[model samples]
Target: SMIDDIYNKRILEFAGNMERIGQLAEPDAVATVHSKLCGSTVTVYLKMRDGVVTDFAHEVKACALGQASSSVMARNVIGATADELRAARDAMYRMLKENGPAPEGRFADMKYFEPVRDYKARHASTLLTFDAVADCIRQIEEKA
Candidate 1:
């Protein structure tokens, strides 16, 4: 079942019920990323305190894979330091682009994307959430 394989039930659920699907009004950092491969776009807004993420919001226009990725990111982003966000992003990229293992720890939920690794076109969409967040974090740090 090709559909069953790529669009797993859990993935669908995550995509369907993703939270924070909008921008923050008073964000300390903001970034927008476009995925050329999947033609998806995401904008992330973040609030930070003492180098730790205090809050985050996003506006995403992407496929199910992209939305699901943002769902997982939203679930774990608060309280994370820049290193955790960057590490999670790096791990996800490596997993999809380099046949690496699934992200672990607070990013353990990303293991749901194991099936997505083989779909090269889906990589950019899957990476959108993390990239936007990383970029937003960079904006925060660069100006701090």
Candidate 2:
């Protein structure tokens, strides 16, 4: 039943609705994260201004869960701040790893992935996009 839940209509819809699906022309930061288990990968490109994201894009080669997560992120990450992204990433981790609630506010669509919590192996791929974005934010901060 977990598979059915994990691959529901909502997840499929989100997976199909992925936005910003390419490289940015001139990114302020970029990061790529890979899942060893599934060989799923996500590369994120970000452009920040005034400490908030001004533009965003990515290359996502991942499973449905990963693609769905990336779609949610792409839809909401344009106006995100580092703190906001970090919070969402942490919340997403907790939701999957600690049985915590899903991320709220703009990242609320992440709740669709709650079923993935029961399947540990799928967690890495599902979280790849968030991890990549977090790393991109970290890279930007390191350069500052």
Candidate 3:
């Protein structure tokens, strides 16, 4: 159906993109999460060495803001580890719930979507990728 194909198509487009800013990361560890509730998806690719994530990449496909945010997160979290990502996950969720932003400093780049803050339907779409990335990391930790 047209509906089912929407996310799948956009996601595949980004996945196949040679412009992948996230392509620099050949993650030893890979994880992803997707949401049907909001038609957003997030994929997390990580490069691990000596038990640390040296690089990270994120991909999201949805709204303008959501797509924008994904590309932003990719750049910022490149060298982040589980601890840093954990804090980001919490802060972003809190901001999203309060209809706020990416806090400050650490997530400043994430504020690219502040223009969409007043948007509710788009909020869910934005968070869809956020939640997916968080779930992917958590699941990876759980099985470890």
Measured against the true structure, the TM-scores of the candidates, in listed sequence, are 0.94, 0.96, 0.64
The sequence of per-residue lDDT tens digits that candidate 1 reaches over residues 5-48 is 88998899989988887778899988889987668998888999
Deviation from native of the Cα of residue 29 in model 2, angstroms:
1.2
Top candidate, metric TM-score? 2
Question: Which candidate order results from sorting by TM-score in descending order?
Answer: 2, 1, 3
Cα lDDT, model 3, residue 81: 65
Q: Kindly provide the TM-score of model 3 when superposed on the true structure, using C-alpha atoms.
A: 0.64
lDDT of 2: 0.90
lDDT of 3 at 61: 61
Instruction: List per-candidate RMSD values in Å.
Output: 1.2, 0.9, 7.5
Best by lDDT: 2
List candidate 1 stretches off by more than 4 Å.
none
How many pairs of residues in model 3 come into backbone collision?
A: 1
The CA lDDT of each predicted structure is: 0.88, 0.90, 0.56
TM-score head-to-head 1 vs 3, winner: 1
Tens digits of lDDT, candidate 3, 49-137 = 44345666665566655665565555555555666767776667667577655656555755545544455566666655456556656
